[PDB]
Design a protein around this ligand. Sequence first.
Ligand SMILES: *SCCNC(=O)CCNC(=O)[C@H](O)C(C)(C)COP(=O)(O)OP(=O)(O)OC[C@H]1O[C@@H](n2cnc3c(N)ncnc32)[C@H](O)[C@@H]1OP(=O)(O)O
Ligand SMILES: *SCCNC(=O)CCNC(=O)[C@H](O)C(C)(C)COP(=O)(O)OP(=O)(O)OC[C@H]1O[C@@H](n2cnc3c(N)ncnc32)[C@H](O)[C@@H]1OP(=O)(O)O
Ligand SMILES: [Cl-]
Ligand SMILES: [Cl-]
Ligand SMILES: [Cl-]
Ligand SMILES: [Mg+2]
Ligand SMILES: [Mg+2]
Lengths: 427, 427
Amino acid sequence: TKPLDGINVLDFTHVQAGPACTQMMGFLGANVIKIERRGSGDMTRGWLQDKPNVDSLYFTMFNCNKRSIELDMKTPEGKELLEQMIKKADVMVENFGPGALDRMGFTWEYIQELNPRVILASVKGYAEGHANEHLKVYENVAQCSGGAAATTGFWDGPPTVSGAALGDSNSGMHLMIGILAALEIRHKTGRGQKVAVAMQDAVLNLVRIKLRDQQRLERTGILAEYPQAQPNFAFDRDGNPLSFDNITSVPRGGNAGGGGQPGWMLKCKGWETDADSYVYFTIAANMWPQICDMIDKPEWKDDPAYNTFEGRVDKLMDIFSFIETKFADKDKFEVTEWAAQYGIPCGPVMSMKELAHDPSLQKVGTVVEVVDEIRGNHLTVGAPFKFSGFQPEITRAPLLGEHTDEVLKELGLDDAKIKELHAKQVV
Amino acid sequence: TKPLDGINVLDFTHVQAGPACTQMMGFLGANVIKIERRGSGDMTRGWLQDKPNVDSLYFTMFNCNKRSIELDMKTPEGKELLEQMIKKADVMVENFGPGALDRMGFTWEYIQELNPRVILASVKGYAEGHANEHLKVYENVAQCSGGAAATTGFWDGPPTVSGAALGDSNSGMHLMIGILAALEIRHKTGRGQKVAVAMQDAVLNLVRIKLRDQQRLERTGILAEYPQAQPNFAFDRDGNPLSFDNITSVPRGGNAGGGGQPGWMLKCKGWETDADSYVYFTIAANMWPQICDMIDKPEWKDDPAYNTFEGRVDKLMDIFSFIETKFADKDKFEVTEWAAQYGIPCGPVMSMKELAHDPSLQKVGTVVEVVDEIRGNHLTVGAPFKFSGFQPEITRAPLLGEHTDEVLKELGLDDAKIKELHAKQVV
Ligand SMILES: *SCCNC(=O)CCNC(=O)[C@H](O)C(C)(C)COP(=O)(O)OP(=O)(O)OC[C@H]1O[C@@H](n2cnc3c(N)ncnc32)[C@H](O)[C@@H]1OP(=O)(O)O
Ligand SMILES: *SCCNC(=O)CCNC(=O)[C@H](O)C(C)(C)COP(=O)(O)OP(=O)(O)OC[C@H]1O[C@@H](n2cnc3c(N)ncnc32)[C@H](O)[C@@H]1OP(=O)(O)O
Ligand SMILES: [Cl-]
Ligand SMILES: [Cl-]
Ligand SMILES: [Cl-]
Ligand SMILES: [Mg+2]
Ligand SMILES: [Mg+2]
């Protein structure tokens, strides 16, 4: 019915990457038990709160479909409690620092002894065996490590961070592939495995297209689809010309097409006061006649200076600036509608306000209103994969330690034994 | 044992999103049969070739661990071949336009009729049910649709695309989670499902943090950690101080942290001639005196308006401007090690030439040199998930129609039938 019905997940994860993974597993039916430290819990509970003493949207948008237990794991009685939980678990997920889980006496070797079928899944900054294996890494450092910062932004500006979570959430989704892959192994062998994703590596996987460019750049000396390939277009902050004559590593291309065909971010009406009043407009090679029709340049259809990719290289940025002139009195939706008539790939820059209140995204289950009778309802992002015979049922994030007694009951413990654990301050 | 050994994948995909999913399935041991159009095949083959009449790096880096068959599906004998293949398939993957397989006679109900166990996996632009259900979307258009472009870049510049493939490869990785999930459903129900990932939703999943920020902004009217919330720092195009007074949708924050822990991108030695001579510097609350030890400012530990997040989030660009001054004579690696002495989270902007030839990444199998005896060797990105009981074996991408007869012989067709299919121009 739901993909991960009956999968028990022992969840040690905190902050963004790990919780993203286990929340999505939760959305697909997994039984997720969140192990948190006493008093404070996941640090996201108290970061960027919109209301004092209420769990922040940081926490609640990453921790739906979970239960929370409190546990001091650096105590003898906390360690025997884990062992019982590990024996019930199908998957153990963690994103502590590199040596953290081993130094608690729960090495992969010992975990295998406790439960032969359990999968250990971890997110790290860098892969095991890497020179930076032992480093603690945060979102933007991870983007810098994996090639994304170097290849994002403008030639005359700094390396630029992406607003998308290429380090954290991306690494969590990659780990989900790892976990589900290990579940498929287990069907054959009957044994669990260890799966690990480095944030640097998850970033690199998405920057594969720029490793393509690096090799083209080495082999040929030029990237013809880049703005710097147009003579006399790009300059540094001191007015020096930028060209591929002197470029040996993949440059920042502004709003160039990347893995798509050539494109640019073009202003629409009201761009001076509206930060998101833009479209992205693509010049696909086989759509040049249609573009010529749209912008009333019939003379450009038969001109070899304009009618091939190769002819347009010395003037592509001039072509985009001319096209942009046609959008000066039209908003982004009107431009997108106009382009659609011609079959030209083109779409608006959607603001976060526009996305948060879009009826379509709520219709399809991608933006979801979570019912939270304790904190008030909030929006979250649902499952991005849609299935023919399954619908996620998203439910609110747990309060700290809300299910501690509930899970101890399930472990076999009776009332008196729980009373002792509370008294010893282990839970 | 590899996770997807024995999984037959009937692969119709082209360009990036679809092929990234099936390649990665191939890396995990899947049997990927790439259906390609006679005489031309996947568009990437001729897309920015570095060598005339040799398959491009775009093709080779997205199509390793696959076999190629040429097939004319708009013929009666071709449809008969496809039906035999669909009966052997575990997963069918496509990124055609809406209704393409329907128009070839292969609706879902008919696929189910041929094979009740087969999974049909699709990438699309917008989710089924969306108002933009049929708009064409690729890479940067999808980045614009899902909120990433709006929230990436600078307040006084345009919405900015990520160099990371937030649209294409990210959707492909998300589809891989969907496919593995549908394989888990099948273990219980014994039936195949449809699973689909829309590019917009794949992008939205990674901008969950900005949907958090949009709700915070709506609820409180301000985002305290954003540059626009700092005392006279962000200036609009007209050279006047910015603030959240007229900001109702999540703005662009340049190189800010994007979470609970502030940061900025800082220049290192050689930045005027080396575009990637930078470090990212993160102020994490749990090592603030450590930063004060490195920066040699002991007055800020004692000062209450410097030692806490609430106190420090109005001196913020004043602090980064200061720290950058003493990286003036040091390269990014020297600066990173100098910070690492004090346990500070500081990391270098890695260029693509550094990443392409980094020994560590090749040691861990994240950057892999592919032995390609036909075209000459090339680099690619490997599997970002590392497993304890399994190693991917990456093999070169197929020539067009290289495995046609090999695949036909597996369907059980004789040498007479195969040679007349060539003569009939079906394969
Ligand atoms: S997506 C952005 C975050 N990046 C990652 O997910 C990458 C992996 N995570 C990390 O590198 C670190 O976890 C980061 C996120 C950098 C935070 O660093 P911390 O300073 O918080 O270091 P740890 O997370 O490893 O935690 C420190 C020690 O605390 C112990 N601990 C946690 N929870 C408990 C409980 N419940 N009970 C007892 N101890 C607990 C950890 O074991 C760890 O122990 P050390 O021995 O001190 O390492
Ligand atoms: S990372 C972002 C990357 N950006 C891009 O990819 C932008 C460029 N993309 C494109 O131009 C198109 O998306 C391409 C790659 C050309 C794919 O277009 P389609 O989705 O239409 O796929 P096809 O070109 O392969 O199909 C065209 C029509 O022909 C039918 N068809 C496909 N393959 C075959 C074979 N082997 N045999 C017979 N017929 C085949 C399709 O069903 C399709 O039919 P329509 O009914 O016209 O849709
Ligand atoms: Cl995230
Ligand atoms: Cl495109
Ligand atoms: Cl694609
Ligand atoms: Mg050069
Ligand atoms: Mg006209």
